[PDB]
Amino acid sequence: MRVKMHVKKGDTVLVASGKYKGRVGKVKEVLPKKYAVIVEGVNIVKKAVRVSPKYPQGGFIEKEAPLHASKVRPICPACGKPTRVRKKFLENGKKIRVCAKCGGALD
Amino acid sequence: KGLAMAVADRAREGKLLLVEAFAGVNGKTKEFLAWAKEAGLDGSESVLLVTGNELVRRAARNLPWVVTLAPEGLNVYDIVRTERLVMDLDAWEVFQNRIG
Amino acid sequence: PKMKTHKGAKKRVKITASGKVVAMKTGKRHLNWQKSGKEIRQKGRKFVLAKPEAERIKLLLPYE
Amino acid sequence: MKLSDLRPNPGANKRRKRVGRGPGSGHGKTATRGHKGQKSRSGGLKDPRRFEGGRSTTLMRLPKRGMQGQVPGEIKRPRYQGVNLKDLARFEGEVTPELLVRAGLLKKGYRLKILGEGEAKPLKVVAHAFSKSALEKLKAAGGEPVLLE
RNA sequence: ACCCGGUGAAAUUGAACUGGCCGUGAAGAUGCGGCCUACCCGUGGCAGGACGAAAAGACCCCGUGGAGCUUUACUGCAGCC
RNA sequence: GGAUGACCCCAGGCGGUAGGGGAGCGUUCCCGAUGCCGAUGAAGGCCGACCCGCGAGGGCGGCUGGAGGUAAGGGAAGUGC
RNA sequence: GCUGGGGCUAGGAGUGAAAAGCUAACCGAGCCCGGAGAUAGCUGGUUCUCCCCGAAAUGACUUUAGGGUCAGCCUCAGGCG
RNA sequence: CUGUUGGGAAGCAGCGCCAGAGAGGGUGAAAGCCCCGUAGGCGAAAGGUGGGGGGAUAGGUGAGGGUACCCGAGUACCCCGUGGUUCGUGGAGCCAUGGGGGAAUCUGGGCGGACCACCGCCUAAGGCUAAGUACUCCGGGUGACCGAUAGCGCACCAGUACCGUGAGGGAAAGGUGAAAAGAACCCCGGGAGGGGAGUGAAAUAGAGCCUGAAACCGUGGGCUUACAAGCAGUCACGGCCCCGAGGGGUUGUGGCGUGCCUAUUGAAGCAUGAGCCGGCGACUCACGGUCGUGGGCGAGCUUAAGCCGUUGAGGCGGAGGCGUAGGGAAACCGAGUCCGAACAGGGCGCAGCGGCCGCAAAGUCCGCGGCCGUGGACCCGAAACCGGGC
RNA sequence: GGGGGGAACCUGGGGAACUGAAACAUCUCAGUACCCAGAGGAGAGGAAAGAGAAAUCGACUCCCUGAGUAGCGGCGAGCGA
Ligand SMILES: [Mg+2]
Ligand SMILES: [Mg+2]
Ligand SMILES: [Mg+2]
Ligand SMILES: [Mg+2]
Ligand SMILES: [Mg+2]
Ligand SMILES: [Mg+2]
Ligand SMILES: [Mg+2]
Ligand SMILES: [Mg+2]
Ligand SMILES: [Mg+2]
Ligand SMILES: [Mg+2]
Ligand SMILES: [Mg+2]
Ligand SMILES: [Mg+2]
Ligand SMILES: [Mg+2]
Ligand SMILES: [Mg+2]
Ligand SMILES: [Mg+2]
Ligand SMILES: [Mg+2]
Ligand SMILES: [Mg+2]
Ligand SMILES: [Mg+2]
Ligand SMILES: [Mg+2]
Ligand SMILES: [Mg+2]
Ligand SMILES: [Mg+2]
Ligand SMILES: [Mg+2]
Ligand SMILES: [Mg+2]
Ligand SMILES: [Mg+2]
Ligand SMILES: [Mg+2]
Ligand SMILES: [Mg+2]
Ligand SMILES: [Mg+2]
Ligand SMILES: [Mg+2]
Ligand SMILES: [Mg+2]
Ligand SMILES: [Mg+2]
Ligand SMILES: [Mg+2]
Ligand SMILES: [Mg+2]
Ligand SMILES: [Mg+2]
Ligand SMILES: [Mg+2]
Ligand SMILES: [Mg+2]
Ligand SMILES: [Mg+2]
Ligand SMILES: [Mg+2]
Ligand SMILES: [Mg+2]
Ligand SMILES: [Mg+2]
Ligand SMILES: [Mg+2]
Ligand SMILES: [Mg+2]
Ligand SMILES: [Mg+2]
Ligand SMILES: [Mg+2]
Ligand SMILES: [Mg+2]
Ligand SMILES: [Mg+2]
Ligand SMILES: [Mg+2]
Ligand SMILES: [Mg+2]
Ligand SMILES: [Mg+2]
Ligand SMILES: [Mg+2]
Ligand SMILES: [Mg+2]
Ligand SMILES: [Mg+2]
Ligand SMILES: [Mg+2]
Ligand SMILES: [Mg+2]
Ligand SMILES: [Mg+2]
Ligand SMILES: [Mg+2]
Ligand SMILES: [Mg+2]
Ligand SMILES: [Mg+2]
Ligand SMILES: [Mg+2]
Ligand SMILES: [Mg+2]
Ligand SMILES: [Mg+2]
Ligand SMILES: [Mg+2]
Ligand SMILES: [Mg+2]
Ligand SMILES: [Mg+2]
Ligand SMILES: [Mg+2]
Ligand SMILES: [Mg+2]
Ligand SMILES: [Mg+2]
Ligand SMILES: [Mg+2]
Ligand SMILES: [Mg+2]
Ligand SMILES: [Mg+2]
Ligand SMILES: [Mg+2]
Ligand SMILES: [Mg+2]
Ligand SMILES: [Mg+2]
Ligand SMILES: [Mg+2]
Ligand SMILES: [Mg+2]
Ligand SMILES: [Mg+2]
Ligand SMILES: [Mg+2]
Ligand SMILES: [Mg+2]
Ligand SMILES: [Mg+2]
Ligand SMILES: [Mg+2]
Ligand SMILES: [Mg+2]
Ligand SMILES: [Mg+2]
Ligand SMILES: [Mg+2]
Ligand SMILES: [Mg+2]
Ligand SMILES: [Mg+2]
Ligand SMILES: [Mg+2]
Ligand SMILES: [Mg+2]
Ligand SMILES: [Mg+2]
Ligand SMILES: [Mg+2]
Ligand SMILES: [Mg+2]
Ligand SMILES: [Mg+2]
Ligand SMILES: [Mg+2]
Ligand SMILES: [Mg+2]
Ligand SMILES: [Mg+2]
Ligand SMILES: [Mg+2]
Ligand SMILES: [Mg+2]
Ligand SMILES: [Mg+2]
Ligand SMILES: [Mg+2]
Ligand SMILES: [Mg+2]
Ligand SMILES: [Mg+2]
Ligand SMILES: [Mg+2]
Ligand SMILES: [Mg+2]
Ligand SMILES: [Mg+2]
Ligand SMILES: [Mg+2]
Ligand SMILES: [Mg+2]
Ligand SMILES: [Mg+2]
Ligand SMILES: [Mg+2]
Ligand SMILES: [Mg+2]
Ligand SMILES: [Mg+2]
Ligand SMILES: [Mg+2]
Ligand SMILES: [Mg+2]
Ligand SMILES: [Mg+2]
Ligand SMILES: [Mg+2]
Ligand SMILES: [Mg+2]
Ligand SMILES: [Mg+2]
Ligand SMILES: [Mg+2]
Ligand SMILES: [Mg+2]
Ligand SMILES: [Mg+2]
Ligand SMILES: [Mg+2]
Ligand SMILES: [Mg+2]
Ligand SMILES: [Mg+2]
Ligand SMILES: [Mg+2]
Ligand SMILES: [Mg+2]
Ligand SMILES: [Mg+2]
Ligand SMILES: [Mg+2]
Ligand SMILES: [Mg+2]
Ligand SMILES: [Mg+2]
Ligand SMILES: [Mg+2]
Ligand SMILES: [Mg+2]
Ligand SMILES: [Mg+2]
Ligand SMILES: [Mg+2]
Ligand SMILES: [Mg+2]
Ligand SMILES: [Mg+2]
Ligand SMILES: [Mg+2]
Ligand SMILES: [Mg+2]
Ligand SMILES: [Mg+2]
Ligand SMILES: [Mg+2]
Ligand SMILES: [Mg+2]
Ligand SMILES: [Mg+2]
Ligand SMILES: [Mg+2]
Ligand SMILES: [Mg+2]
Ligand SMILES: [Mg+2]
Ligand SMILES: [Mg+2]
Ligand SMILES: [Mg+2]
Ligand SMILES: [Mg+2]
Ligand SMILES: [Mg+2]
Ligand SMILES: [Mg+2]
Ligand SMILES: [Mg+2]
Ligand SMILES: [Mg+2]
Ligand SMILES: [Mg+2]
Ligand SMILES: [Mg+2]
Ligand SMILES: [Mg+2]
Ligand SMILES: [Mg+2]
Ligand SMILES: [Mg+2]
Ligand SMILES: [Mg+2]
Ligand SMILES: [Mg+2]
Ligand SMILES: [Mg+2]
Ligand SMILES: [Mg+2]
Ligand SMILES: [Mg+2]
Ligand SMILES: [Mg+2]
Ligand SMILES: [Mg+2]
Ligand SMILES: [Mg+2]
Ligand SMILES: [Mg+2]
Ligand SMILES: [Mg+2]
Ligand SMILES: [Mg+2]
Ligand SMILES: [Mg+2]
Ligand SMILES: [Mg+2]
Ligand SMILES: [Mg+2]
Ligand SMILES: [Mg+2]
Ligand SMILES: [Mg+2]
Ligand SMILES: [Mg+2]
Ligand SMILES: [Mg+2]
Ligand SMILES: [Mg+2]
Ligand SMILES: [Mg+2]
Ligand SMILES: [Mg+2]
Ligand SMILES: [Mg+2]
Ligand SMILES: [Mg+2]
Ligand SMILES: [Mg+2]
Ligand SMILES: [Mg+2]
Ligand SMILES: [Mg+2]
Ligand SMILES: [Mg+2]
Ligand SMILES: [Mg+2]
Ligand SMILES: [Mg+2]
Ligand SMILES: [Mg+2]
Ligand SMILES: [Mg+2]
Ligand SMILES: [Mg+2]
Ligand SMILES: [Mg+2]
Ligand SMILES: [Mg+2]
Ligand SMILES: [Mg+2]
Ligand SMILES: [Mg+2]
Ligand SMILES: [Mg+2]
Ligand SMILES: [Mg+2]
Ligand SMILES: [Mg+2]
Ligand SMILES: [Mg+2]
Ligand SMILES: [Mg+2]
Ligand SMILES: [Mg+2]
Ligand SMILES: [Mg+2]
Ligand SMILES: [Mg+2]
Ligand SMILES: [Mg+2]
Ligand SMILES: [Mg+2]
Ligand SMILES: [Mg+2]
Ligand SMILES: [Mg+2]
Ligand SMILES: [Mg+2]
Ligand SMILES: [Mg+2]
Ligand SMILES: [Mg+2]
Ligand SMILES: [Mg+2]
Ligand SMILES: [Mg+2]
Ligand SMILES: [Mg+2]
Ligand SMILES: [Mg+2]
Ligand SMILES: [Mg+2]
Ligand SMILES: [Mg+2]
Ligand SMILES: [Mg+2]
Ligand SMILES: [Mg+2]
Ligand SMILES: [Mg+2]
Ligand SMILES: [Mg+2]
Ligand SMILES: [Mg+2]
Ligand SMILES: [Mg+2]
Ligand SMILES: [Mg+2]
Ligand SMILES: [Mg+2]
Ligand SMILES: [Mg+2]
Ligand SMILES: [Mg+2]
Ligand SMILES: [Mg+2]
Ligand SMILES: [Mg+2]
Ligand SMILES: [Mg+2]
Ligand SMILES: [Mg+2]
Ligand SMILES: [Mg+2]
Ligand SMILES: [Mg+2]
Ligand SMILES: [Mg+2]
Ligand SMILES: [Mg+2]
Ligand SMILES: [Mg+2]
Ligand SMILES: [Mg+2]
Ligand SMILES: [Mg+2]
Ligand SMILES: [Mg+2]
Ligand SMILES: [Mg+2]
Ligand SMILES: [Mg+2]
Ligand SMILES: [Mg+2]
Ligand SMILES: [Mg+2]
Ligand SMILES: [Mg+2]
Ligand SMILES: [Mg+2]
Ligand SMILES: [Mg+2]
Ligand SMILES: [Mg+2]
Ligand SMILES: [Mg+2]
Ligand SMILES: [Mg+2]
Ligand SMILES: [Mg+2]
Ligand SMILES: [Mg+2]
Ligand SMILES: [Mg+2]
Ligand SMILES: [Mg+2]
Ligand SMILES: [Mg+2]
Ligand SMILES: [Mg+2]
Ligand SMILES: [Mg+2]
Ligand SMILES: [Mg+2]
Ligand SMILES: [Mg+2]
Ligand SMILES: [Mg+2]
Ligand SMILES: [Mg+2]
Ligand SMILES: [Mg+2]
Ligand SMILES: [Mg+2]
Ligand SMILES: [Zn+2]
């Protein structure tokens, strides 16, 4: 129906694999189509740019690469630890993501 | 005959074991593992567990080294596959009926 | 499909107890006036088929 | 004994003959069929069990014999299967057609007729027919012949 | 048609380092034997050979192969009496 | 001889079309396998004057390749040009 | 007489100043799809290895004669000796 | 979760943990615990369904005695011509009916293979009727199913391009990388293309992109060749070159030497096929049969459909089949029977190993193999025939 | 209310030939291919003017068996309850 995303713009996440394993950053963007996220200051690539009105003089620019969503884990804004996500039904009775280590909200 | 011989082979090997009941195993795998230890089943040897008690089968099932059967399901390929045979008495009785 | 018995064999021939094949003798269907009584009498008996042609016929009767 | 130790006996599973597979196989080129002719062709020959190259066949030169019967076919009458006295020695007490059905001696829907090969045993045997010698032997041996219709 | 610049096919082709004579060979040999002759490679030309190319001979025979046609061949059918 | 494929000694046979028989090699797939080999490099590709086998083949090693492969013993075929 | 446009007649059927002519570049019976993998006693082709043995081209009969059935000749297994 | 190697951990190491979940797919490599899932559970306001559960409704219901009113008409029935059935005119009934003739209403009429009698069975000429059965456009699940010449004709924008007046025919064509980070900028060039710089673990991964075989074309190097006669090799020797009492490459001279396949009495043959390379390409399967073989049981052996259970678990099911007895056209008899007057004569038939135990075996069941029968039956190939269309 | 469409499946009305019979005509292929009409999630069939010997069974459909039996057949090839 729709791609499952355990992560969203813009809660804070640990990169748990790859070259940036262990870094922490905000979720800048989520690309459900590719099942990939953009994490601030993580996966920086050097791309060349043509001399243009945008970039006269030109040369290169730094850009963040998309990361496979599985490579990323939200951090609990309560206990402060990287965790998996559970769901919880309130009285509304809406559902929310919650930390599995403590019962913290994850929004 | 194949069914008889299959069991008989494991007996001659000292690998056949009949159990009376299964202690405190009531569906949770970690319970079976407890009971396993008490009967010599560390899992260095693969086991064919034959019993009609569902909760015992459901506990022991997810293990890599355990194959599970109701006694009417006893069959020689499953017997030969596994290094040890473990049967409830209830099971051994019906295995008896099928071979005579 | 299962084989079918050759009926023209079944009507002419018989497989004995040991698997020999027996038939009536040929040659007195007619033209008998000038034949001897010895010809006629002998030709009234059954005979046993040569091994090769008998083995062919048993195969055409696979349910006897 | 374990799974890798499972083996057929020598001779139990034999390999197939594969023709048409290279010179050294001994079955190459013509695939053991020889050269040309009807037999070598796909489809092969006419049924060798009967056909003889066009001349009247061996079978077809023999005369037919006896009643073959007519539509509407077979005439339903009672049928007799005989069973010998020697076959009856295994039983005690009373023997009747149904018993010898069960023991797998007499075929169903067949009428019992006792025959005389073997000995007689002092049984009460119940049949639809007895042979002369079976009647004597069995009466002589303290048995009791019992006739059904 | 030839030469120079430009573009650039084809059927065919087992591979080939592919000579003459007298012989031999499945009976007409570049390819076997004996002899003779012959430095390596092209170009324009000619058509004797490569049983040259092309077309699984169109003639003939064979196949219990086919098809068109004939008739006082056989057996039917329409049609007509 | 030893005792039954343990190997040794002696003796004989071993050209081959149609074809009969015997024993093997390899390819795809299944059980073995919740295993094992594998980024310290899977398969495949290119070499080798090396090793084992009568041979079909199987190893080993160097280079290429970059993610698969699959034993002893058995099973089944879309199995060798 | 020739010719444009619009129409009709077709497969054992049309059409033919008659050539079995023509019916969409091969008409003594069009083309397409189907029965269909028709049938082909004929021709071609038939794929790894090693080991043992090893023919026939005759007789009989055959709408048979370059195809068959049985015999003869080959091979394997069991038995006899 | 930490460490270590690595571009990248899921690998290896260390210490844990879950499991009614260790099916499987992913993530930079090989992950039970990162992701998607899995075991086990939960879910419909609306529309469809609803064979199950409930309820209504239609509809359903006596016995004697009398009466002889009714009980399906161009019908039964008979004859002619046919079809259906296993039945092809056969002793030919039955069911159906194109033609002709033409009834009866239970004391009526049809059938039980011509017909007759006796004895039974059944109620024609009006209609309806679930389920058990068939198929797979469609959705899902599973493969000792394919893996881009395979698998559907199509993995790709295919019934397309293209061919045909039309019916109709009918393709080819998948892969950068973990990530576009898809190469700014300078240099030669009109452009294409390239050389640098740069990215990347890797750029003979650069998009005409994984691997990159062979035919085929080229550059460079060693050896060799212009007096030599050739199925192109081989054996010997010598020279030169390379690698370090030996091997490898090359070939001057000498010896020997008639391609492969097919078809044939016989081919180098001037007989067939083949330009070369790569990939596709031909003895199979089902059911019967017959021998052989490996096992289970043995005067016995064995189940089929189905039913229950599993969800790659097996069991039940004895209906039936083969065998236990043969002889005879058959009646029939039976270790005998047939022919015959025969007690004659003949044909075809009849009778384990050891010390009750073992061992073997009739037979039978299953597996395997050879061959046979029916199927297109080892693969390719007709000229033709027929049907419907164009 | 009807009309028209739907991959196969179903019923009904029509209905071939190659081929097999090692020729061919009855026979076979086969009531198959195909054409047409109608149905429907199925269709047909279905509550005995039945079976056929059981003194019996009890609508129909469908599977197994009966059985390659009984029979049918240029008593050929084959067909087949
Ligand atoms: Mg969700
Ligand atoms: Mg990591
Ligand atoms: Mg870290
Ligand atoms: Mg909501
Ligand atoms: Mg295991
Ligand atoms: Mg397990
Ligand atoms: Mg006679
Ligand atoms: Mg005569
Ligand atoms: Mg007579
Ligand atoms: Mg007569
Ligand atoms: Mg005289
Ligand atoms: Mg006389
Ligand atoms: Mg006389
Ligand atoms: Mg006489
Ligand atoms: Mg039978
Ligand atoms: Mg019999
Ligand atoms: Mg096999
Ligand atoms: Mg063999
Ligand atoms: Mg072949
Ligand atoms: Mg070979
Ligand atoms: Mg052979
Ligand atoms: Mg040979
Ligand atoms: Mg051949
Ligand atoms: Mg052969
Ligand atoms: Mg052969
Ligand atoms: Mg041949
Ligand atoms: Mg020959
Ligand atoms: Mg040939
Ligand atoms: Mg010949
Ligand atoms: Mg031949
Ligand atoms: Mg020939
Ligand atoms: Mg052929
Ligand atoms: Mg063919
Ligand atoms: Mg043929
Ligand atoms: Mg003749
Ligand atoms: Mg009969
Ligand atoms: Mg009848
Ligand atoms: Mg008594
Ligand atoms: Mg010049
Ligand atoms: Mg020029
Ligand atoms: Mg050459
Ligand atoms: Mg020259
Ligand atoms: Mg001469
Ligand atoms: Mg001349
Ligand atoms: Mg010549
Ligand atoms: Mg000459
Ligand atoms: Mg010359
Ligand atoms: Mg030469
Ligand atoms: Mg010579
Ligand atoms: Mg010469
Ligand atoms: Mg000269
Ligand atoms: Mg010239
Ligand atoms: Mg010339
Ligand atoms: Mg000339
Ligand atoms: Mg000229
Ligand atoms: Mg010339
Ligand atoms: Mg020449
Ligand atoms: Mg010429
Ligand atoms: Mg030529
Ligand atoms: Mg020309
Ligand atoms: Mg020409
Ligand atoms: Mg040709
Ligand atoms: Mg020709
Ligand atoms: Mg020609
Ligand atoms: Mg010709
Ligand atoms: Mg001629
Ligand atoms: Mg001719
Ligand atoms: Mg003729
Ligand atoms: Mg002929
Ligand atoms: Mg002809
Ligand atoms: Mg004709
Ligand atoms: Mg007229
Ligand atoms: Mg020797
Ligand atoms: Mg020898
Ligand atoms: Mg030899
Ligand atoms: Mg041998
Ligand atoms: Mg191979
Ligand atoms: Mg093998
Ligand atoms: Mg598979
Ligand atoms: Mg596995
Ligand atoms: Mg694996
Ligand atoms: Mg490892
Ligand atoms: Mg690496
Ligand atoms: Mg490497
Ligand atoms: Mg491999
Ligand atoms: Mg593979
Ligand atoms: Mg090798
Ligand atoms: Mg490699
Ligand atoms: Mg993988
Ligand atoms: Mg394997
Ligand atoms: Mg293996
Ligand atoms: Mg196995
Ligand atoms: Mg193949
Ligand atoms: Mg005009
Ligand atoms: Mg005009
Ligand atoms: Mg016009
Ligand atoms: Mg006009
Ligand atoms: Mg006209
Ligand atoms: Mg017209
Ligand atoms: Mg018209
Ligand atoms: Mg038309
Ligand atoms: Mg025509
Ligand atoms: Mg005509
Ligand atoms: Mg015609
Ligand atoms: Mg005409
Ligand atoms: Mg004119
Ligand atoms: Mg046309
Ligand atoms: Mg024309
Ligand atoms: Mg014609
Ligand atoms: Mg034309
Ligand atoms: Mg069509
Ligand atoms: Mg056909
Ligand atoms: Mg065919
Ligand atoms: Mg023909
Ligand atoms: Mg022909
Ligand atoms: Mg020899
Ligand atoms: Mg001869
Ligand atoms: Mg003869
Ligand atoms: Mg003659
Ligand atoms: Mg001949
Ligand atoms: Mg011929
Ligand atoms: Mg022979
Ligand atoms: Mg001899
Ligand atoms: Mg022999
Ligand atoms: Mg011998
Ligand atoms: Mg590192
Ligand atoms: Mg780690
Ligand atoms: Mg670990
Ligand atoms: Mg599971
Ligand atoms: Mg897994
Ligand atoms: Mg996985
Ligand atoms: Mg990677
Ligand atoms: Mg692993
Ligand atoms: Mg793996
Ligand atoms: Mg995983
Ligand atoms: Mg569930
Ligand atoms: Mg679920
Ligand atoms: Mg009343
Ligand atoms: Mg009345
Ligand atoms: Mg009525
Ligand atoms: Mg009426
Ligand atoms: Mg009547
Ligand atoms: Mg009639
Ligand atoms: Mg008829
Ligand atoms: Mg008749
Ligand atoms: Mg009739
Ligand atoms: Mg009657
Ligand atoms: Mg009638
Ligand atoms: Mg009528
Ligand atoms: Mg009356
Ligand atoms: Mg009456
Ligand atoms: Mg009637
Ligand atoms: Mg009746
Ligand atoms: Mg009657
Ligand atoms: Mg009745
Ligand atoms: Mg109805
Ligand atoms: Mg119902
Ligand atoms: Mg219905
Ligand atoms: Mg139904
Ligand atoms: Mg589907
Ligand atoms: Mg695959
Ligand atoms: Mg492709
Ligand atoms: Mg394709
Ligand atoms: Mg490829
Ligand atoms: Mg598709
Ligand atoms: Mg396209
Ligand atoms: Mg056209
Ligand atoms: Mg067009
Ligand atoms: Mg076409
Ligand atoms: Mg394609
Ligand atoms: Mg890629
Ligand atoms: Mg990609
Ligand atoms: Mg530039
Ligand atoms: Mg420029
Ligand atoms: Mg550029
Ligand atoms: Mg450049
Ligand atoms: Mg560049
Ligand atoms: Mg770099
Ligand atoms: Mg690396
Ligand atoms: Mg490379
Ligand atoms: Mg690459
Ligand atoms: Mg390329
Ligand atoms: Mg890749
Ligand atoms: Mg490449
Ligand atoms: Mg390339
Ligand atoms: Mg190359
Ligand atoms: Mg050079
Ligand atoms: Mg000189
Ligand atoms: Mg010189
Ligand atoms: Mg010379
Ligand atoms: Mg020398
Ligand atoms: Mg040398
Ligand atoms: Mg050297
Ligand atoms: Mg030389
Ligand atoms: Mg020579
Ligand atoms: Mg030569
Ligand atoms: Mg020669
Ligand atoms: Mg060759
Ligand atoms: Mg060849
Ligand atoms: Mg050839
Ligand atoms: Mg020839
Ligand atoms: Mg010739
Ligand atoms: Mg000749
Ligand atoms: Mg030559
Ligand atoms: Mg030549
Ligand atoms: Mg020629
Ligand atoms: Mg030639
Ligand atoms: Mg020729
Ligand atoms: Mg060509
Ligand atoms: Mg070439
Ligand atoms: Mg090739
Ligand atoms: Mg075969
Ligand atoms: Mg067997
Ligand atoms: Mg058994
Ligand atoms: Mg049977
Ligand atoms: Mg006698
Ligand atoms: Mg005797
Ligand atoms: Mg035994
Ligand atoms: Mg046995
Ligand atoms: Mg067999
Ligand atoms: Mg063979
Ligand atoms: Mg055979
Ligand atoms: Mg077929
Ligand atoms: Mg076939
Ligand atoms: Mg065959
Ligand atoms: Mg054809
Ligand atoms: Mg034509
Ligand atoms: Mg004709
Ligand atoms: Mg015609
Ligand atoms: Mg037509
Ligand atoms: Mg037409
Ligand atoms: Mg309508
Ligand atoms: Mg409609
Ligand atoms: Mg019909
Ligand atoms: Mg109608
Ligand atoms: Mg009809
Ligand atoms: Mg017609
Ligand atoms: Mg015909
Ligand atoms: Mg045909
Ligand atoms: Mg036939
Ligand atoms: Mg014919
Ligand atoms: Mg014929
Ligand atoms: Mg003809
Ligand atoms: Mg015909
Ligand atoms: Mg046929
Ligand atoms: Mg018919
Ligand atoms: Mg019809
Ligand atoms: Mg059809
Ligand atoms: Mg309709
Ligand atoms: Mg249904
Ligand atoms: Mg209905
Ligand atoms: Mg009624
Ligand atoms: Mg029977
Ligand atoms: Mg007959
Ligand atoms: Mg028929
Ligand atoms: Zn928390």
Short structural description:
With 107 residues, chain A is mainly beta.
Structure description:
Chain A: One of two assembly initiator proteins, it binds directly to the 5'-end of the 23S rRNA, where it nucleates assembly of the 50S subunit. One of the proteins that surrounds the polypeptide exit tunnel on the outside of the subunit. Chain A: InterPro entries: KOW (IPR005824), Rib_uL2_dom2 (IPR014722), Ribosomal_uL24 (IPR003256), Ribosomal_uL24_CS (IPR005825), Ribosomal_uL24_KOW (IPR041988), Translation_prot_SH3-like_sf (IPR008991). Chain A: It holds the Pfam family ribosomal_L24. Chain A: Belongs to the universal ribosomal protein uL24 family. Chain A: Keywords: Ribonucleoprotein, Ribosomal protein, RNA-binding, rRNA-binding. This is part of a larger assembly, with chains A (107 residues), B (100 residues), C (64 residues) and D (149 residues). Chain A is mostly beta strands. Chain A contains no helices and 9 strands. In chain A, the strands form 3 sheets. Chain A has a 5-stranded antiparallel sheet with strand order 6-3-2-1-7, with no helix packed on it. Chain A has a two-stranded antiparallel sheet with strand order 4-5. Chain B is an alpha/beta fold. In chain B, helix 2 packs across helix 3 (54-60). Chain B is globular. The termini of chain B are close together. The relative contact order of chain B is 0.24. The radius of gyration of chain C is 15 Å and the shape is elongated. Chain C has a 3-stranded antiparallel sheet with strand order 1-2-3, with helices on one face. In chain C, strand 1 (13-15) and strand 2 form a beta hairpin. Chain D contains 3 helices and 6 strands, in the order βαβαβββαβ. Chain D has helices spanning 85-88, 97-102, 132-140; strands at residues 80-84, 94-95, 111-115, 124-127, 129-130, 144-147. In chain D, the strands form 2 sheets. In chain D, strands 1-3-5 form a 3-stranded parallel sheet. Chain D has a 3-stranded parallel sheet with strand order 2-4-6. The longest helix of chain D is centred in the last third of the chain and has 9 residues, at 132-140. Chain D is flat, with a radius of gyration of 29 Å. The chains are: A mainly beta (107), B alpha/beta (100), C alpha+beta (64), D alpha/beta (149). Chains in contact: B-D, C-D. The B-D interface holds B 9, 13, 80-81, 83 and D 1-3, 6. One magnesium ion binds next to loops of chain D. One magnesium ion binds at residues 17, 21 of chain A. Chain D binds 5 RNA strands through strand 1 and helix 3.
